[PDB]
Design a protein around this ligand. Structure first.
Ligand SMILES: NCc1cccc(NC(=O)c2cccn3cc(CN4CCCC4)nc23)c1
Lengths: 156, 39
């Protein structure tokens, strides 16, 4: 169906009406989303079918039609933009300075923006428009708000 | 059956809404891909 690069909504008809379960990035013929959005299931793009190619539950990432293509990284200094695609709402660029998730295996950038769960898979981008990660896997802090990691895969 | 629909271009937009703070949190990542807070 549509293989043009960009941001896409991930919809399902299995629940009430047409529900947006997530978001993804089409780059170089490959669709990139978070694992929890599709659970590894096949996707439809008009009349064409997209089959999973790579996936990892711990990274919470999945790629379709080919290997993971997104390899830019947050520079640990500069502001970034979450290209938020909320359910039923227009794509909107939100500029922010990322915080940090400190883990036993190293530090990871994090964006403190609260959006509906169906916004999972929305890309986080740098000043060059390159996707440095996806939004949607993180934690709930003291006041109940969501803080998401900047989740990036590996380009082989 | 899940289906996709285009929502826009991936480009940096000048003069976009600037919001959100930058917290430094101690977190743990489990085998099921779930992040939890460590305090
Ligand atoms: N470990 C993978 C995994 C599995 C299942 C779900 C997720 N992600 C989320 O739930 C999520 C994503 C994006 C923004 N959010 C905002 C909130 C706040 N919640 C919404 C319902 C009540 C409060 N939750 C989210 C991640």
């Amino acid at each position: 169906g549509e293989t043009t690069d960009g941001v896409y909504r991930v919809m399902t008809r299995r629940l009430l009406g047409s529900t947006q379960v997530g978001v993804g990035v089409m780059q170089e013929g490959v669709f990139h989303t978070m694992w929890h959005v599709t659970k590894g299931a096949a996707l439809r793009s008009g009349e064409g079918r997209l089959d999973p190619y790579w996936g990892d539950v711990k990274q919470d990432l999945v790629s379709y039609c080919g290997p993971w293509k997104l390899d830019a990284a947050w520079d640990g200094l500069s502001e970034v933009q979450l290209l938020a695609v909320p359910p039923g709402e227009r794509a909107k660029n939100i500029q922010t300075l990322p915080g940090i998730f400190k883990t036993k295996d190293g530090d990871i950038g994090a964006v403190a923006l609260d959006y509906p769960a169906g916004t999972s898979g929305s890309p986080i981008l740098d000043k060059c428009g390159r996707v440095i990660g996806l939004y949607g896997n993180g934690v709930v802090i003291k006041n109940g708000s969501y803080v998401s990691a900047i989740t990036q895969g590996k380009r082989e | 059956d899940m289906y996709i629909e285009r929502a826009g271009d991936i480009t940096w937009e000048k003069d976009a809404e600037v919001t959100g703070n930058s917290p430094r949190l101690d977190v743990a990542l489990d085998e099921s891909g779930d992040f939890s807070l460590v305090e």
